[PDB]
Design an enzyme around this catalytic site. Structure first.
Site, PDB file in Angstrom:
ATOM      1  CB  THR A   1      59.113  48.830  48.633  1.00 21.61           C
ATOM      2  OG1 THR A   1      59.446  49.166  47.290  1.00 21.61           O
ATOM      3  CG2 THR A   1      59.131  50.105  49.460  1.00 21.61           C
ATOM      4  CB  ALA A  49      55.039  51.839  40.959  1.00 25.86           C
TER       5      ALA A  49
HETATM    6  C1  LIG Z   1      57.162  52.899  44.780  1.00 26.56           C
HETATM    7  C2  LIG Z   1      56.962  51.418  44.476  1.00 26.56           C
HETATM    8  C3  LIG Z   1      57.785  51.041  43.234  1.00 26.56           C
HETATM    9  C4  LIG Z   1      57.268  50.534  45.670  1.00 26.56           C
HETATM   10  C5  LIG Z   1      57.168  49.029  45.348  1.00 26.56           C
HETATM   11  C6  LIG Z   1      56.934  48.287  46.609  1.00 26.56           C
HETATM   12  O1  LIG Z   1      56.403  48.871  47.547  1.00 26.56           O
HETATM   13  N1  LIG Z   1      55.941  48.673  44.760  1.00 26.56           N
HETATM   14  C7  LIG Z   1      55.866  47.778  43.820  1.00 26.56           C
HETATM   15  O2  LIG Z   1      56.907  47.280  43.433  1.00 26.56           O
HETATM   16  C8  LIG Z   1      54.526  47.325  43.251  1.00 26.56           C
HETATM   17  C9  LIG Z   1      54.232  45.970  43.938  1.00 26.56           C
HETATM   18  C10 LIG Z   1      53.683  46.073  45.323  1.00 26.56           C
HETATM   19  C11 LIG Z   1      52.410  46.913  45.307  1.00 26.56           C
HETATM   20  C12 LIG Z   1      53.381  44.692  45.921  1.00 26.56           C
HETATM   21  N2  LIG Z   1      54.495  47.239  41.811  1.00 26.56           N
HETATM   22  C13 LIG Z   1      53.799  48.093  41.013  1.00 26.56           C
HETATM   23  O3  LIG Z   1      53.180  49.009  41.525  1.00 26.56           O
HETATM   24  C14 LIG Z   1      53.836  47.891  39.444  1.00 26.56           C
HETATM   25  C15 LIG Z   1      54.777  48.924  38.730  1.00 26.56           C
HETATM   26  C16 LIG Z   1      56.126  48.362  38.326  1.00 26.56           C
HETATM   27  C17 LIG Z   1      55.983  46.906  37.855  1.00 26.56           C
HETATM   28  C18 LIG Z   1      56.864  49.197  37.241  1.00 26.56           C
HETATM   29  N3  LIG Z   1      52.416  47.910  38.908  1.00 26.56           N
HETATM   30  C19 LIG Z   1      51.640  46.795  39.131  1.00 26.56           C
HETATM   31  O4  LIG Z   1      52.016  46.006  39.997  1.00 26.56           O
HETATM   32  O5  LIG Z   1      50.521  46.478  38.303  1.00 26.56           O
HETATM   33  C20 LIG Z   1      49.496  47.523  38.065  1.00 26.56           C
HETATM   34  C21 LIG Z   1      48.206  47.143  37.280  1.00 26.56           C
HETATM   35  C22 LIG Z   1      47.000  47.856  37.375  1.00 26.56           C
HETATM   36  C23 LIG Z   1      45.857  47.493  36.648  1.00 26.56           C
HETATM   37  C24 LIG Z   1      45.861  46.394  35.784  1.00 26.56           C
HETATM   38  C25 LIG Z   1      47.045  45.652  35.657  1.00 26.56           C
HETATM   39  C26 LIG Z   1      48.191  46.019  36.390  1.00 26.56           C
END
Ligand SMILES: CC(C)C[C@@H](C=O)NC(=O)[C@H](CC(C)C)NC(=O)[C@H](CC(C)C)NC(=O)OCc1ccccc1
Ligand SMILES: [Mg+2]
Ligand SMILES: [Mg+2]
Ligand SMILES: [Mg+2]
Ligand SMILES: [Mg+2]
Ligand SMILES: [Mg+2]
Ligand SMILES: [Mg+2]
Ligand SMILES: [Mg+2]
Ligand SMILES: [Mg+2]
EC number: 3.4.25.1
Lengths: 212, 196, 233, 220, 203, 52, 222, 195, 195, 196
Positions: A1, A49
């Site tokens: 992001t 997210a």
């Molecule tokens: C607003 C966001 C979409 C911004 C974006 C990047 O910053 N974030 C993201 O893309 C992050 C990854 C990042 C934290 C490394 N991904 C996420 O936040 C994703 C949600 C999408 C896959 C729909 N959730 C996730 O990574 O796993 C959550 C989880 C929690 C508990 C058990 C198993 C899994």
């Protein structure tokens, strides 16, 4: 992001990418990373997210309630402080949020607060946030100018998220553009990187690292 | 520790070694692991000595209260009370307890309660570190409905062998006899049981 | 329970044309010590349900008591407790599933795998599984632990798909079950030769067979197996 | 993987499933797990696929040299000693697990062998992730003095048990039949009970669908 | 793990009297994309080798195989065939059983004598994927499996094979953060080889 | 979505009950009923213009 | 050390059409290398033309579907049987999930239905509540195999109009229910071929203005 | 950490390398030159583990000079970079790996072209219009992706580096004490004193 | 890390605090003021854990202002510092400790004296002629041990801080983006724009 | 595993269960743990099957070489060779081995070699996971100089009980008889020994 907001002569530009990832899996390229809290106030989402979507939506609720109660829109400072106070209550729980709260009131003028899950809240004229923040910075900083025309600023913001989308594995999708003035925010569209990159490579003669 | 309890024709007999160790040091060479929780309901203790003393103490209290309110508790009821305490606090006890009683209807009864707090009614039960070594011996020598003397001998032979092989067992062999005639305490010294 | 102490191995089961069969051996193990040999792990609830349980035997006993209590409670102010308003297998299952998931979710599991077998009031076979995680599933055959690995493949040759069910008789199903019990005795180091079997039939009711023994074993060929490669005598 | 071995009145039969897996993915849906040590000595492997194949080749090569040197037909027990000594020397780190079967001048033989170097002998054996399902069949249907056709059927049923019940296993059955007095009979895809159904459409793209930046001829 | 530091993918497919092999152009260091021109496909005579994994090993293996095949051609007085090269790759990899190169090589080519299309894949210690419809490798291998099993059909003409392997690669890559950033495709027949650079997303 | 006007009304009435037992069994929140009433006016998509 | 989580495999697939939506799942349920069931449905009609699948740890999935169906029941009690709109279902499911943000349901949720203009809708959730409305989404075990395929076939990604020098995209088009089912079936037969956790059966729930209908297809059983 | 940057323009390659040397909470030196000349038209800058960087670079230099003397010929930039890469690939799987990343600027006198090689400690090598080691690439790559043109003069390359260094002094957390800039072209290697 | 310095001279206390705010490899801000005024003659600067520093300082400020209003009297520097210390001592043994170190500059209007308090997150408090938090004390304490005199004017105190900051920019590894200097004296609190 | 060897009046008898497990899976139900290293010198194996096979193999090789050079090796010598391999490689073996032989002078001999490689000559020896359970039984039932039949019975009873209690033991009971008359192999099936 990658997310960025900056103040300049004509107000505020806000620009974000739209990629979401899980490990090295591109989960989506269409994620909306700006929330429209009210017509004068924007929030941006970086980090988790769920953490972002949930808490900024909730922040929106607190802002509305403030308006019902006090018969005035909440200030940028106070809205960003609601979010900051909340995340700080959770400090250590494992929240993951890098956010910007951006908008206008007559009292403050155009205003940007950086707010993260550490409890850090900062007022500032320029922020880039996310895994691609350094790529945005390098482009934005190089060509930033207080007296950019509104058009040049919109483009510089777009061009900066584009630079991040190209180089950061975890950024991409499209660019979402906003301009904020004393009359509030105005949307400047969704720009798919799929066609944007080539268009800019041609128009600009940049991206010479790439085979065209 | 080597503890057992054996039903027989007239009631039940509890037996135990008398050794308590910490490390390789025998902290008590004459421990009394045969613990009374009601007149003709007793128990054998193995595991943490703090835990088994603490358990038996509270079980004695429950059965005293039981008696003044409801009358004589059954052997089963005593096993129930032990079980409840051992099972519910399983994450914080090391107790291997044999509950043994006499009454006029069932005569002798034996309930073993292993680590974890399950409960098992049995014609006889062995337990403690030393019992491993006598599984085969006890299986081949136990009969239902033995006489008192035959039963004393079985336990003497059983615990003598467990003491022989187990470093955590030793000292004297203690026995308690529960029948209609009452409660009898026996003791056997190394120079007797080591020759069997 | 944070870790199991006294344990029961496989429970296995299958549907047949008019009901269900379930079996489990009579052993309570204590690590590698084959400690207790008359441990009943099939639990009849009323005339229409048998709950078979593997895993921690202390937790099994606790569940037994929960079930008796259900029976008791259901009868209170219930003039049809032996009839229209008796416990259905589906009620017993849903209750246990609720309990297992709750305990999983408090980080304090009942350390068991459970199969609930019976016949519903409309005559439908009931066969459903729940474990320490709160995981649930049905299938024409179900087996826990070790039995999932060796009994299931045997049992599925009999009832492979839903349509095989009405083609399957008690006689055939019972033979399949018993054979699987023999196979488990051959290859599960925590199995016993002695086991219980229960049939729940829409017509004949519950038939509970205690003290079965694994019979008709092959050990013959063992006389000819010598050394581990080159040794001839 | 599911491999089995079954002795019969006049030889031995070996069989395997045909699925190889990168994690929960199937890399090869029609792989070949039945390897030749020598013309009448064949082996099936589970465990680490490279180790299983490599160690097969090493011993096969040596067995061949041994046979040329001694002017004798290779003996199954020779493959056995060479393999177990090699695997033991490596202390389990060569993750080969094999069923080795064969006929030689001394008769017909059936062995299993594990990564640490231990070996077993019997009339029927199984290895790999699907070995419990297969062994359940073997334990249900084996009898002394099988004919060739009965041992093929039994071994083939056992592989099937793994194909159907073991996620680690799948696709086809391969058998090799080693009868005393005859050429080894290798039956590749003896059974093929898992053909993909016809897809609902062809996904052929119209030519020119794919954008090209530049093009050029390469000279070999 | 080493096999996902630099990122990247390779896929090869058979068609009618042709084979094709393709790869992305990315070389990155975790999330940082660094090189936009890191090809992963090499050739020794008429035999093609693609390699995914740790870039330094990709480069090392190439040099090792150019070395080995050059000696082969000198001694054998003819260029190595895809079948023979496949075994060579396997044993070279296995030689490093306990300290392996972190790679996923892929071989494609047409035997000069049978005229028969040939492909194969390898795990990092030389196990051979004898499969002959398609072979995939790299950080988007899941995606590639999915794309290939879907899009592929046997005996495609070269012009059609080109579309198929392109769409398989392009769509797999766009669902992988560590792959993409350009691609090359080789269509290989007896008398002609065509290399093409694909247009793809640059994010 | 927008709260339906009747729901909102029902929600205010539930609070009003809190000098005694709540509509969902809650314990009392206050020591006397309110001494005020409300005319609640609104629009929603299900029942249009409403006055309560 | 008690691990409260498991993995039951399975794969799911939602595609939105112009006036319909589809939610598909395989019927296989697994534990490590074993098959628990060849037919244990995981896509559910929750009422109000809402279909739902919570895929991954089946115990959490079941719990989540149960809580949601209950949420509908009470929505109806509170609002005189008012239809819960799909966007409203989605926001609610966000809250159920984020309620357990610090001990999450280990599942991938998809729901499908019709919006307030009668157009097909799919929503996709992460384990803690993040969601977006999408045109297509695969979830679960073989999602990494099936999603790029859908990108290409449902949204014509990377396809250009020939003769246009890769300058003109293949224009987006709504697929019919026939064409969608074809894609769903092919996705799953493909997933079944390459993923050991997919097989046995394919259940498809099809939502239109007239309601929810179901189709079932066998998948290979190995 | 150490800044190591490279920009290859039309007629030359330009290397920029930070002057700081820092241990714990002490900047020990603010004038440290992080390069060795390998041959008159080949320069290598270096970053990485204390000790390893100089030990590695001088070993390479010694070997390159030896070849120069033995053959009375200067190896190409392409040939030198390949020797460096191989030495690092051997290193990474040796008993003690050099933890050194390098940039190689050279002017190929035969091809009459500037070449710039980025090679890390694993033996990963790539030729690039511009390159960087360390955290600096996180700002410079995108900046040059925007500002760099292929037709540029040496002076323009220099301006490009003024932009990069200005940004790193703005956004990098550590005080790297400026840079030394060196130009490699057809006439050899020189340092730009007025930077 | 954050520079937080204090020098108490004859007629005033002077606080100097770094302007940088840094996360990972990004300087987010170069103009950050790391102080809150607690009362007209009392200033507190702060360093430590993200979030904790502002949350703690504002909590103290709110409480101090409340006392100001309730009593219509300004607590002494000595009284304020003791309240801050106690709050930190409670903190360190609470379920979540503030990880904040502070300097308190105040002018005691009754005693007519400047006072300077150094208090760390454990609740360790000491009054000092000069103080520092973080790694900066490793250079400033010895420097002031050499240069600081008790008789000094405000201007001399300022020169003393110019010396400290010059040294830290020389030897500290991180770019802390300058300082903001504030003077606390009998007339209150003011910032020295020309620093 | 349950292995033993028992000297008696005419020589020595080796006995063993036939179960090999990995985890709770019985990988071999008819294992032959009675391993020959010379004509009338054999051994019983417990521990890692790779280790004990590898050891016995090399010991058989040493004694073959011994025989062609020096003549018939003694039982003691065989125990020496095992010991040397077990002791020297103690850090990389899990082997519990009983060595048992016949010769005309000593008749039967038994040497147990526990983990670590010490060696102990004994009138009888028990070993393996299952032996723990039969310490007391074997102690009470072993006599010196039993007949062949009395000795077979002792082992049958002993190993039957060890198999009864030990999950790591089971299958058939194997026996090898070493005397002047030669080498005899016996087998007993569950339906026989489980009734004793
Ligand atoms: C607003 C966001 C979409 C911004 C974006 C990047 O910053 N974030 C993201 O893309 C992050 C990854 C990042 C934290 C490394 N991904 C996420 O936040 C994703 C949600 C999408 C896959 C729909 N959730 C996730 O990574 O796993 C959550 C989880 C929690 C508990 C058990 C198993 C899994
Ligand atoms: Mg003793
Ligand atoms: Mg891969
Ligand atoms: Mg990609
Ligand atoms: Mg990107
Ligand atoms: Mg709605
Ligand atoms: Mg499958
Ligand atoms: Mg299978
Ligand atoms: Mg046993």
């Amino acid at each position: 992001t990658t997310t960025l907001a900056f103040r300049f002569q004509g107000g505020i530009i806000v620009a974000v990418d739209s990629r979401a990832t899980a490990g090295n899996w591109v989960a989506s390229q269409t994620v909306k990373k700006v929330i429209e809290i009210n017509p004068f106030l924007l929030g941006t989402m970086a980090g988790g997210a769920a953490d972002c979507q949930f808490w900024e939506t909730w922040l929106g609720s607190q802002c509305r309630l403030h308006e019902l109660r006090e018969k005035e829109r909440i200030s940028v400072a106070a809205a960003s402080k609601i979010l900051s106070n909340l995340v700080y209550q959770y400090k250590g729980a494992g929240l993951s949020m890098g956010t910007m709260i951006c908008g206008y009131t007559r009292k403050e003028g155009p205003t940007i607060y950086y707010v993260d899950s550490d409890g850090t809240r900062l007022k500032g004229d320029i922020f880039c946030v996310g895994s691609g923040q350094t790529f945005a910075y390098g482009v934005l900083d190089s060509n930033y100018k207080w007296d950019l025309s509104v058009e040049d600023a919109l483009y510089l913001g777009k061009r900066s998220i584009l630079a991040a989308a190209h180089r950061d594995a975890y950024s991409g999708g499209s660019v979402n553009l906003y301009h904020v003035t004393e009359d509030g925010w105005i949307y400047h569209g969704n720009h798919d990187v799929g066609e944007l990159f080539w268009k800019v490579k041609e128009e600009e003669g940049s991206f010479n690292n790439v085979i065209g | 520790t080597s503890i057992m309890a054996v039903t027989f024709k007239d009631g039940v007999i509890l037996g135990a070694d008398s050794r308590t160790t910490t490390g390789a040091y025998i902290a008590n060479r004459v421990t009394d692991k045969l613990t009374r929780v009601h007149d003709k309901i007793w128990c054998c203790r193995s595991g943490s000595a703090a835990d088994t003393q603490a358990i038996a103490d509270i079980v004695q209290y429950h059965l005293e209260l039981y008696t003044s309110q409801y009358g004589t508790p059954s052997t089963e009821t005593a096993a129930s009370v032990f079980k409840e305490l051992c099972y519910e606090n399983k994450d914080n006890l090391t107790a291997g307890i044999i509950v043994a009683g006499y009454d006029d209807k069932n005569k002798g009864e034996v309930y073993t309660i292993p680590l974890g707090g399950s409960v098992h009614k049995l014609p006889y039960a062995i337990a403690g570190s030393g019992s491993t070594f006598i599984y085969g011996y006890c299986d081949k020598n136990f009969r239902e409905n033995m006489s008192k003397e035959e039963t004393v001998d079985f336990i003497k032979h059983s615990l003598s062998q467990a003491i022989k092989w187990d470093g955590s067992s030793g000292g004297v062999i203690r026995m308690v006899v529960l029948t209609a005639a009452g409660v009898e305490r026996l003791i056997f010294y190394p120079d007797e049981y080591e020759q069997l | 329970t944070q870790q199991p102490i006294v344990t029961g191995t496989s429970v296995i089961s299958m549907k047949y044309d008019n009901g269900v069969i379930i079996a489990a051996d009579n052993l309570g193990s204590y690590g590698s010590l084959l400690r207790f040999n008359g441990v009943e792990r099939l639990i009849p609830v009323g005339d229409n349900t048998v709950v078979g349980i593997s895993g921690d035997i202390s937790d099994m006993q606790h569940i037994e008591r929960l079930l008796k209590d259900l029976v008791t409670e259901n009868a209170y102010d219930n003039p049809l407790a032996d009839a229209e308003e008796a416990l259905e297998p589906s009620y017993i299952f849903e209750y246990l599933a609720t309990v297992m998931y709750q305990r999983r979710s408090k980080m304090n599991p009942l350390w068991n795998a459970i199969i609930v077998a019976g016949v519903q009031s409309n005559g439908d076979q009931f066969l459903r599984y729940v474990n320490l995680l709160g995981v649930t599933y049905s299938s024409p055959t179900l087996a826990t632990g070790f039995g999932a690995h060796m009994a299931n493949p045997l049992l599925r040759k009999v009832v492979d798909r839903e349509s095989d069910i009405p083609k399957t008789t008690v006689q055939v199903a019972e033979e399949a079950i018993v054979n699987a019990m023999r196979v488990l005795y051959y290859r599960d180091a925590r199995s016993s030769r002695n086991f219980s079997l229960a049939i729940i039939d829409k017509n004949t009711g519950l038939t509970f067979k205690k003290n079965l023994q694994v019979e008709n074993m092959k050990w013959d060929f063992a006389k000819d197996i010598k050394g581990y490669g080159t040794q001839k005598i | 993987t599911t491999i089995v071995g079954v002795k019969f009145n006049n030889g031995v039969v070996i069989a395997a499933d045909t699925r190889s897996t990168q994690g929960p993915i199937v890399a090869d849906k029609n792989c070949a797990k039945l390897h030749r040590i020598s013309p009448k000595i064949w082996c099936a492997g589970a465990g680490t696929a490279a180790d299983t194949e490599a160690v097969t080749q090493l011993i096969g090569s040596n067995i061949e040299l041994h046979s040329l040197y001694t002017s004798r037909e290779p003996r199954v027990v020779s493959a056995l000693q060479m393999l177990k000594q090699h695997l033991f020397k490596y202390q389990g780190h060569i993750g080969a697990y094999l069923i080795v079967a064969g006929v030689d001048p001394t008769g017909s033989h059936l062995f299993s062998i594990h990564a640490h170097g231990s070996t077993d002998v019997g009339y029927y054996l199984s290895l790999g992730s699907g070995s419990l399902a297969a062994m359940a069949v073997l334990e249900s249907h084996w009898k002394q003095d099988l004919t060739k056709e009965e041992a093929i059927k039994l071994a083939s049923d056992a592989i099937q048990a793994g194909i159907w019940n073991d996620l680690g296993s799948g696709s086809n059955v391969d058998v090799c039949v080693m009868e005393i007095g005859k050429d080894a009979e290798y039956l590749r895809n003896y059974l093929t009970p898992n053909v993909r159904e016809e897809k609902q459409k062809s996904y052929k793209f119209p030519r020119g669908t794919t954008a090209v930046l530049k093009e050029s001829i390469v000279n070999i | 793990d080493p096999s996902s530091i630099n990122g990247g993918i390779v896929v090869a497919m058979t068609g009618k009297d042709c084979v094709a092999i393709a790869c992305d152009l990315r070389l990155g260091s975790q999330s940082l994309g660094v090189s936009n021109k890191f090809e992963k496909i090499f050739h020794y005579g008429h035999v093609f080798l693609g390699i995914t994994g740790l870039a330094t090993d990709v480069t090392t293996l190439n040099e090792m195989f150019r070395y080995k095949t050059n000696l082969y051609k000198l001694k054998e007085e003819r260029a190595i065939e895809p079948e023979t090269f496949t075994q060579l790759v396997s044993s070279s990899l296995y030689e490093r059983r306990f300290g392996p190169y972190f790679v996923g090589p892929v071989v494609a080519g047409i035997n000069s004598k049978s005229g028969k299309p040939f492909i194969a894949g390898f795990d990092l210690i030389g196990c051979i994927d004898e499969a002959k419809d398609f072979i995939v490798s790299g950080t988007a291998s899941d995606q590639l499996f999915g794309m290939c099993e879907s899009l592929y059909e046997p005996n495609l003409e070269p012009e059609d094979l080109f579309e198929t392997i392109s769409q398989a690669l392009l769509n797999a890559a766009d669902r992988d953060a560590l792959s993409g950033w350009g691609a090359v495709v080789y269509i290989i027949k007896k008398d002609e080889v065509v290399k093409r650079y694909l247009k793809m997303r640059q994010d | 979505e927008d709260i339906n006007v009747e729901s909102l009304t029902q929600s205010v009435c539930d609070l009003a009950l809190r000098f005694g037992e709540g509509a969902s069994g809650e314990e009392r929140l206050m020591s006397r009923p309110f001494g005020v009433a409300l005319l609640i006016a609104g629009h929603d998509a299900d029942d249009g213009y409403q006055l309560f | 050390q008690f691990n409260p989580y498991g993995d039951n495999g399975g794969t799911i697939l939602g595609i939105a059409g112009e006036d319909f939506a589809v939610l598909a799942g395989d019927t296989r349920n697994i534990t490590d290398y074993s098959i628990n069931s060849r037919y244990e449905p995981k896509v559910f009609d929750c009422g109000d033309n809402i279909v739902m699948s919570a895929n991954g740890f089946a115990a959490d999935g079941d719990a989540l579907v149960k809580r949601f169906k209950n949420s509908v029941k009470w929505y109806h009690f509170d609002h005189n049987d008012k239809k819960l709109s799909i966007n409203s279902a989605a926001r609610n499911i966000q809250h159920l999930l984020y309620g357990k943000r610090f001990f999450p349901y280990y599942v991938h949720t998809i729901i499908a239905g019709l919006d307030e203009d009668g157009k097909g809708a799919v929503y996709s959730f992460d384990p803690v509540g993040s969601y977006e409305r999408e045109q297509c989404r695969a979830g679960g075990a073989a999602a990494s195999l099936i999603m790029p395929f859908l990108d290409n076939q449902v949204n014509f990604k990377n396809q250009y109009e020939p003769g246009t020098n890769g300058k003109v995209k293949k224009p987006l088009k709504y697929l019919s229910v026939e064409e969608v089912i074809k894609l769903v079936r092919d996705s799953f037969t493909s997933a079944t071929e390459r993923h050991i956790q997919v097989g046995d059966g394919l259940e498809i729930l099809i939502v239109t203005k007239d309601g929810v209908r179901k189709e079932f297809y066998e998948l290979k059983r190995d | 950490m150490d800044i190591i940057l490279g920009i290859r323009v039309q007629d030359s390659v330009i290397l920029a390398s930070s002057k700081a040397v820092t241990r714990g909470i002490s900047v020990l030196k603010d004038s440290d030159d992080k390069t060795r000349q390998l041959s008159p038209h080949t320069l290598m800058s270096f970053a990485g583990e204390a000790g390893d960087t100089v030990q590695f670079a001088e070993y390479i230099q010694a070997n390159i000079q030896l070849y120069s003397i033995r053959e009375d010929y200067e190896l190409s930039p392409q040939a030198v970079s390949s020797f460096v890469r191989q030495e690092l690939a051997k290193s990474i799987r040796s008993r003690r790996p050099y933890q050194v990343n390098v940039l190689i600027g050279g002017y190929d006198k035969k091809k009459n072209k500037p070449e710039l090689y980025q090679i890390d400690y694993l033996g990963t090598k790539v030729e690039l219009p511009y390159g960087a080691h360390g955290y600096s690439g996180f700002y410079t790559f995108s900046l040059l992706d925007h500002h760099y043109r292929p037709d540029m003069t040496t002076e323009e390359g220099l301006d490009l580096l003024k932009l990069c260094v200005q940004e790193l002094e703005k956004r990098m957390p550590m005080d790297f004490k400026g840079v030394i800039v060196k130009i490699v072209d057809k006439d050899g290697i020189r340092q730009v004193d007025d930077f």
